Amino acid sequence: ARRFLCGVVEGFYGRPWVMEQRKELFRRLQKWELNTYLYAPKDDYKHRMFWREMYSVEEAEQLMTLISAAREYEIEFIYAISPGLDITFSNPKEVSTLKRKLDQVSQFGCRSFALLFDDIDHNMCAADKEVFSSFAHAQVSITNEIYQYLGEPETFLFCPTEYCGTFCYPNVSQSPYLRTVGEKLLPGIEVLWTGPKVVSKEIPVESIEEVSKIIKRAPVIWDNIHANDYDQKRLFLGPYKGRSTELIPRLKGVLTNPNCEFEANYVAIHTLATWYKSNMNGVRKDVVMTDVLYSPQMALKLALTEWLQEFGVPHEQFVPGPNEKPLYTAEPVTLEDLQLLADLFYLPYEHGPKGAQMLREFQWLRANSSVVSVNCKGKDSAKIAEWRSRAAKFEEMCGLVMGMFTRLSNCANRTILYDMYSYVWDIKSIMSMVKSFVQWLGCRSHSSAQFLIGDQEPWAFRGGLAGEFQRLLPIDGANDLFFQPP
Amino acid sequence: RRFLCGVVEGFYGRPWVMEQRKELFRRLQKWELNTYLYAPKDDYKHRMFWREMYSVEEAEQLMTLISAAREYEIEFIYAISPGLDITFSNPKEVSTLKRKLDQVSQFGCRSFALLFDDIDHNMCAADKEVFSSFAHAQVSITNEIYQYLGEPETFLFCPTEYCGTFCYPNVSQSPYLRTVGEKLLPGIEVLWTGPKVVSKEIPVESIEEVSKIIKRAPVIWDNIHANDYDQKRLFLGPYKGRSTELIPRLKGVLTNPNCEFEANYVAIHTLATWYKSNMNGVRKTDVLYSPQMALKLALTEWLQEFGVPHQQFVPGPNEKPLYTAEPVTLEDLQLLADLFYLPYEHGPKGAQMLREFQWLRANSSVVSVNCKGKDSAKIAEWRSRAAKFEEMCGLVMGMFTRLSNCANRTILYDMYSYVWDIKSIMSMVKSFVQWLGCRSHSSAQFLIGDQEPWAFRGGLAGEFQRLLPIDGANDLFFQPPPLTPTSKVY
């Protein structure tokens, strides 16, 4: 019986989700007892780049249908807006534009709102510097004014420029900016925080205790963990991890900002749910000495067993004799399938256990390929027995990557595979070649040729040029490599 | 004089939609091409489950597509692939093949193809008791269907050995291809992808040789600009590799493009330029077609597709200036295509962009420590080149920024993954050059945020890629240790 915003924020750069997805997202948030959606796609011209522009007629059609579906499924809908690059804070025509706009969205029927000054510039126009002491004074000034103008609504969020640890000048505890915000932002307005980093691997309890104290209020975490709009493109099907259930009593909310690809955000949200549900009634426990619950590996196993249900089933008749060619058949996705997929495409900072192992083993076999190579007669009869045994469980395990792909690709409704096809087709491709290499390594004693695959050696082109460049950036070590014979 | 030029939709992966298939027809006609071949590998009723009749919702849509093709003056060819689980000897099986082609013939299809590509040579026992060979079976049934349909104008056969590499023991004396030649009814045309799957170039004798054993001229299935096989590259380069010479040695050309629908602009436009270049010729490096030229005519036309760049308040002269989106330009599209050129060679711009970066890297030594024998031709060579480089790393970021501030983002979003990764590494590369060039203002490690994200080799598949065998050259570069230790003990 305490208010807590927990859900999803669509806040990434890239081609935004469309309606029948958002409509699904709401079904899902509801089913798993979460309660909030933040609308803040970086690619909606009208949300940020071109904020002054009022929504179109066709646009108002779409926007209102959303807000109803949201209200239908018991999900608090928040409209967000980012004037920053463009805006001139002091000139009051500017402020009027902003109020008009949010009144249009108010009209479409949204009740809760949000301003963000995220990823903008530190510097004001001279015009504004003549009115305002600080950059922060500026933001707070008009944030407050809008807050009141819309009649001090229950839910209202402000995302500061300094939105995580590594972004406060000079440090969290004495940032003149975060002070001003803390002091002068109105008390009903909540603050968004992405943790100690932008994409924060862990969110220490003492982190939150610090930033809480300077902004005079327990923040709402915008959590960029499973987000994938930053570097090279990767996919994160791993669980919610790195935040203690202890955080929950010290927070007004957690809103996960995940993978651009929509269908990849099942586990990302499902586990966030389990995490919240686990300790939503806990009391502040004094864990930083200053005055059975939740397992990522379990929450994952639940989510994947449940995910299975959305992959759905795979695809007089003809019946071939016992010497006729046997009918193509489609098998279902297994659980073990998803469990491998999640481990291959896990979290930004580590792989999952099934994936970690395939590497360790490949890496062993590579570093021991010499033990079978004519060489010192036998040198050892049981060092060999091991490498051969150990090679053939690796051959077999590659096997299950190839199967994982086929069962996903035959399962009759391909909307989930298709939404992440590139990602899955890359790993399965490369494993095909890695299996073929380990085989070649078993046979290189009575040949001295080179490892080739239909004469092409194609793993060299992966990424094309994008990749050629990245492969020149600095590496620690060249103990590995395995050069090739001419 | 009747010659099949156009597009085959023949790729592994998610098929093109009705709405895109109509626009392909508009563009084919605009550019005066004539043919379309329906062979999407993912349509369950095309290959895997070929013996299921189309439902009414599906029948409805394929009638509409066929009508479309009629409206835009395009030959529509319905292919079918029964090679995975067919039992050749059994007649219920040939019945079914017939009934399925009859279903499609009533949707108003005039022309047809049978495909036996990307399968193994291994027949079942019942069949080995009846046909002399895999060819013999493939041929018996194809002839029988072709006839059953009243020997249509246009009927295609894709062989299992559909290129040089795939032949055994080799093109000239394959027993598979010998039999196709001898026994495949003369009326039927045969597909062929060149000497490889993705043929870098298609020499004229290569065609003379295959032409001889199949005893006809082939229609080329061209995988040059396809990415079905490797979904980490995109191919915005020009048709090239194939002499205008072989236009009279062929019966047609059907390109198999990128899976992404909107990357196939240059790839078709330049193909059409090439066909026109010599529609009417006789028998007996390439004087009528220049890729460099045909590429530029294509980029110039593609640009009007990208549309216009989005956009009563005025800022004071001391107030905060307005946002301003900028137009995409032609040096933008020229750089894009040059970064995403062809399967076997980069664009000259991209190719330079790299050569420069690898030089700067190799002569880092000179700017690492102090100054000694560091001339014009030592240091202030580097300093110069390094800033000429830095500026063009800049230009990449431009073309992304401007592509993503179009009013109509369709063309971008269809290639987002590819164009994003290129700009994100260029960014990451520029910062390296900077650090190289002032390793004496301190002596850090090279870092971003405060770790190194390029090291995640874009995924787990990435960390496996690096452990496969390596050139032995394009020499490495190493990150120095943290320098700052934490123990008394050595």
Author numbering:
A (entry chain B): 57 to 347, 372 to 395, 536 to 706
B (entry chain A): 58 to 341, 370 to 396, 537 to 715
The authors write:
The regulation of O-GlcNAc cycling on thousands of nuclear and cytoplasmic proteins is coordinated by two enzymes. Composed of two ordered domains, the N-terminal glycoside hydrolase domain forms a (β/α)8 barrel, while the C-terminal stalk domain is composed of six α-helices. α17, consisting of Glu676–Pro694, undergoes a dimer ‘swap’, playing a structural role that contributes to dimerization. Structural characterization of the human O-GlcNAcase orthologue (HsOGA-L/HsOGA) showed dimer formation both in solution and in the crystal where it has been shown to be promoted by helix-exchange in contrast to the non-helix-exchanged bacterial dimers.
Following the co-expression strategy of Roth et al. using pACYC-Duet-1 Gly11–Gln396 and pET-YSBLIC3C Lys535–Tyr715 plasmids, the successful pair of mutations was Glu602Ala/Glu605Ala (HsOGAE602AE605A). The space group was P3121, which is a lower symmetry group compared with P43212 for the HsOGA11–396+535–715 structure.
